[PDB]
Design a protein around this nucleic acid. Structure first.
Length: 51
DNA sequence: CGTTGCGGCAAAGTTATGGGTAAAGTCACACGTAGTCACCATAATGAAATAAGATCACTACTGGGCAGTACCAGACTCGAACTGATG
């Protein structure tokens, strides 16, 4: 019952150790939204999201 | 024994009481008795009103994200050219 942006900002991003994750979790996590394609990619960000 | 007063005995006399029978009184039939306020509690609405409830409008306070900007490479693709085998 929460918005996916809210879930990413308040539940996922603090759990991610990356600096930009924590920083953008408090001014609008537009970095993870403008590049939502890479969340499904082969790379490190996709694997981090799965973890 | 003769007389006189006294007392028992049993009709006789006097009141009283509950019955019957003719005969003097008594009284309703005469259009008429029912009829009428006064009385205070209970149901029973209908109106008066509720006390709270419902919504509008305004004022102030405080979370807080989106369109846009920016870099640092890694990696695939391919002009343009080099160079070797060959019929």
């Amino acid at each position: 019952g929460v918005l996916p942006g809210v879930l990413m900002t308040r539940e996922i991003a603090p759990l991610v150790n990356k600096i930009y994750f924590q920083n953008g979790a408090n001014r609008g996590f537009r970095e993870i939204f403008n590049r939502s394609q890479a969340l499904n990619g082969m790379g490190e960000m996709a694997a981090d999201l799965v973890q």
